Structure 1
């Protein structure tokens, strides 16, 4: 009778909300209940049980050092967790991260998702409300993403950032100051430790990785991507790269003139005249768009860096950076990806804030990038063995990476505020006619100003 976690799968935030004992404690209190304390109390109850079989007393011991004022009562806990500092809150968040850090397919991660606006589900939540958030749950493209992403990571780490310190594994990161949003990350460069804790410094750099299967190709006669590919290789530049982005049926980058409203196809956009190969665009002057329009304002004229790699077929096994072409290409604020990157940006921002990370008078919101990785299949021409850079083995079974586009994303503080507001108030909406506990939301999230 091992794996006691399978037994814990029913103890979710929503279920916590409907227990006799929550009801009791919330019956006799002064205001509504406050929301981040609630999430923190629940977590405390989850672990108090989880720790009975895994000896990870981290979380509780801490939560318990706060109840100065067999364990204290719902009431004592709620109150200590209510008077806690943003910094103290952010300590519990890092406990939770460190616990979930391995096993992204631990069961706990699922129990923790309940009640939480995941960053994968921020835009969707915004569109269709939160129900999904309070409900629950490899040989093709997904697997492609899953064994290629780490090469893309070595490219960023070892060669884009010439070996800066970083970490690649992240557990689940709850938003400390509201306990309603959460995230995890592919990758962060410029980052230190304090124990089992990952400490985000104010020189941190986020990268969202995206291997792009719909561009995978082969050096073979008849392959249609291979020419434009060869061309880019030979003559690495804007116009060359346009041809490649465009060699397929549905290009990942779209032209969208000023004051017009971009489509929803995928997440790369351009205003550069060159990328233009035909047509008219529905006027995005927003009777309704002040929000995306702000972001386009903020983002066009972002320049992103294309790095083209060396063919290990003509450099005896070596894959290193052969060219660094600057281009004008920027995020699409209608796409899902803008939203998860927004929240990554917001949350981590918060962590630095509340862990002594920030010099007065200076900003430490990290930088946030998108990374769009292009690969090709190994032909029989290719050396059995390969290295990234000069001295790091490429995985024997990974595809040969070909290019990598990096794209700084830009997040106007008012756009953030609007997004998290409306989504948050939707959260409270659902809560309000589902629970009678319905916790109240933090002001920083009240919506209008």
Structure 2
């Protein structure tokens, strides 16, 4: 009779918005029900139920201290309407710490209904928000066996490298819950890694020396230390002579390369998410022109980013080095991000939401700006040779999981994000939310006027 969360799966935001109890107070409101308030009331109600069989009363006691047997939804909707942003962001990071442990849990899912997640922002812009008001499958998790299993299996080791090697410290928060954007209650984010975060016992205090790191492991670049493998040669060349020239040949050793040469004022394709205008990278052809016609957004971003220089890190080969994976070399390179690609959006929301936390959490210094830095780590692995030692340490002393493949390169790319671009993007996205909420509810909650479209 155990797993009471298997039961709470009917109590999604959408459903709450459709409750008779909901409708109760929204009848006797003056205004179209406002929206972060509505989301926070829902959260309070889902908690009131959950807290029983999970003991953690904490979220609710906060909501309670805001209003002065349980208080009536009108008392609650109204104290949440009057709350200061700090107080909002507290509530959000109650929900964050409340989910930190288990991305596997079912609550992670119930919370995701009605929230434009960051992975789904570009899709949501292009196709609209219906998938965002829809249940999410088993996946499975059983015998995963391919690109997506490669993803999960490694996305650890790459944090180990980022934390320990790239910035000199392994004491960094790697587990992140679900972070609702506190000021809007519409968007959501889950961080991969983020450096310079501090604690409050259960809470994670983002400081303003925060660095976000989106991790991607390029499965299409997997290869073996073995004659006949096609990438291997161009790689041993990289190893021995690390630099732009060598690395170009590596990037280009597969059918579909991950960097794309697109010259200033041309529109980039969509292949994937790295671009470069640096000439050395140019071996054939011509590009549609990216102008006026809408491309204004991708144009402002392209401009802001094509000055960005990324760092390549060439790792030492564990086999040639008594099992040591250290930073052998540090080639700087001229590669930046594809503002057309899915990731650019995912990483823009990750930057917008954390900005918000950082700001309204004890933490902003007048005169100075607290937007974090964002980067995309693009990790290159090879397969395990028979030659490689059974055991391996990153650096001197960090074990490396025996199931994981060998890290070979790591390419970190700063992302630059004009407030210009953020405002519109999120804005046309949130009207899309409104849009659907309007003819699915009856009482659609009104969007905060800071995601209002225009001036």
TM-score range, shorter chain: over 0.9
Aligned residues: 448
* Partner SS for 1:322: strand
RMSD: 0.7
Deviation at 1:286, TM superposition (A): 2.7
Offset at 1:289? 1.1
- Whether the aligned pair in 2 keeps the contact of 1:90 and 1:354 (CA below 8 Å) is yes
1:197-216 matches, within 5 Å, as: 197-216=203-222
- How many angstroms does 1:396 deviate by? 1.2
2:140 corresponding residue in structure 1: none
Alignment partners' CA distance in 1, 2:133 and 2:84: 28
Q: CA deviation at 1:313?
A: 1.2
Specify the alignment match of 1:28 in structure 2. Answer: 28
CA-to-partner distance for each residue in 1:20-55, whole Å, 9 max, x for gaps? 111121011111100000000000000000011110
Secondary structure of the residue aligned to 1:101 is coil
Deviation at 1:166, TM superposition (A): 1.5
1:380-421 Cα deviation digits (max 9, x unpaired): 111111110011111111101100000000000010000010
d(CA) in 2 for partners of 1:391, 1:28: 64
Partners of 2:426 and 2:227 in 1: how far apart?
Answer: 51
Residue 140 of structure 1 pairs with residue 139 of structure 2: no
Distance 2:104 2:178 in 1: 11
CA distance in 1, matches of 2:61, 2:378: 43
Q: Could you tell me how far apart the structure 2 residues matched to 1:105 and 1:166 are?
A: 22
Counterpart contact for 1:125–1:423, Cα < 8 Å = yes
* Map of 1:160 onto structure 2: 166
The aligned counterpart of 2:408 is 402
User: In structure 2, what is the Cα distance between the partners aligned to 1:333 and 1:294?
Assistant: 9
Distance in 2 (alpha carbons) for counterparts of 1:306 and 1:343: 25
Secondary structure of the structure 1 residue equivalent to 2:346: helix
Name whichever of 329-338 and 165-174 sits farther off.
165-174
SS at match of 2:76: helix
TM-score by length of 1: 0.99
How big is the shift at 1:165? 3.9
Q: Please give the alpha-carbon distance, in whole angstroms, between the structure 1 residues aligned to 2:403 and 2:438.
A: 51
Q: Is the CA contact 1:217–1:223 (under 8 Å) kept in the aligned structure 2?
A: yes
Aligned with 1:25: secondary structure?
helix
Asked if 2 retains the 8 angstrom alpha-carbon contact of 1:308 and 1:324, the reply is: yes
Contact 1:165/1:191 (<8 A) preserved:
no
Shift of 1:164: 6.2
The C-alpha deviation readout for 1:54-85, integer Å capped at 9, x for no partner, is 101010011001111x2000100000001000
Tell which deviates more after alignment, 82-91 or 279-288: 279-288
Check conservation: 1:66, 1:81, Cα contact below 8 A: yes
CA offsets, 1:248-292, max 9 Å, x none?
000000000111100011000000101101000000113111111
SS in 2 for 1:15: helix
Map of 1:48 onto structure 2 = 48
**Which residue of 2 is the match for residue 309 of structure 1?**
315
User: Helix, strand or coil: the match of 2:38?
Assistant: helix
In 1, the alpha carbon distance for the partners of 2:201 and 2:85 equals 20
CA distance in 1 between counterparts of 2:19 and 2:383 reads 55
> By how many angstroms is 1:184 displaced?
0.2
Structure 1 runs (4+) greater than 3 angstroms displaced: none
**1:369/1:409 contact within 8 Å kept:** yes
**SS of aligned partner of 1:208:** strand
Query: What do residues 102-139 of structure 1 show as CA deviations (whole Å, max 9, x unaligned)?
Result: 11010000000000000000000000110111111111
Question: Residue in 2 aligned with 1:264?
Answer: 270
Deviations 1:152-175 (A, max 9, x none): 111000010011642110010000
Deviation string 1:218-264 (CA, Å, 9 cap, x unpaired) is 11111010000000001000010000000000000000011110001
Does the CA contact (< 8 Å) of 1:190 and 1:205 recur in 2?
yes
1: CA distance, partners of 2:366 / 2:351: 20
1:13–1:114 Cα contact (<8 Å) kept:
yes
Stretches of structure 1 that go unaligned for 5 or more consecutive residues are: none
Distance 1:254 1:332 in 2: 9
- The question of whether the paired residues in 2 share the 8 Å contact of 1:33 and 1:437 is answered with yes
Distance 1:393 1:19 in 2: 52
Do the aligned residues in 1 keep the contact of 2:242 with 2:314 (CA within 8 Å)? Answer: yes
**Once the 2 structures are TM-superposed, how far is the Cα of residue 358 of structure 1 from its aligned partner?**
1.1
CA distance in 2, matches of 1:51, 1:317: 48
For residues 203 and 211 of structure 2, what CA distance do their matches in structure 1 show? 17
Q: Deviations over 1:203-230 (max 9, x none)?
A: 0000001111100111111101000000
Q: Deviations over 1:141-198 (max 9, x none)?
A: 1111111111111100001001164211001000000100000011011010012001
CA shift at 1:340, angstroms?
Answer: 0.6
Partner of 2:382: 376
TM-score w.r.t. structure 2 length? 0.98
